[PDB]
Amino acid sequence: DKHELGQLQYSLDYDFQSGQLLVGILQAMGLAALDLGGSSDPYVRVYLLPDKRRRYETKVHRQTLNPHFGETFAFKVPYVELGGRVLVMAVYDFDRFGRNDAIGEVRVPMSSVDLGRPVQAWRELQAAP
């Protein structure tokens, strides 16, 4: 048996008026413990490959496997140029004395998505590629 890394809720919306992709990070659930104490200090990292210098982060939530994020993030790119891009939503356990530990991620290849209407999804977290 593989255990699940965690369930993540998020939203995609293309804002045609402002010309931006809106990524909303709503919450996570049943995240994995990456501290010995049996909890984590989760935060999500969000960016739009192949561009990796434009990287956002959520606030860190001390000690919880069911964080409520509630943050929205913007990427200025035209609906047409959104093609070959993949959206990465990377959950991490903040460790103050060392590398922060990867919990898991969701990668959304933007080519495959319907974005006429807005979208709200839950996705299982997968290990890094």
Stretch that binds Ca ion, among 2-10, 19-27, 40-48, 83-91 (CB under 5 A): 40-48
Residue 85 burial class via C-beta count within 10 angstroms: exposed 0-12, middle 13-18, buried 19 and up:
middle
Q: Any contact of residue 105 with Ca ion (CB under 5 A)?
A: no
Q: Any contact of residue 93 with Ca ion (CB under 5 A)?
A: yes
**Distance, CA of 125 to CA of 40 (rounded, Å):** 15
Q: Which is nearer to Ca ion, 14 or 92 (CB)?
A: 92
Tokens read off for 104:
């898991």
Chain residues binding Ca ion by CB under 5 A are 34-35, 41, 93, 95, 98-99, 101
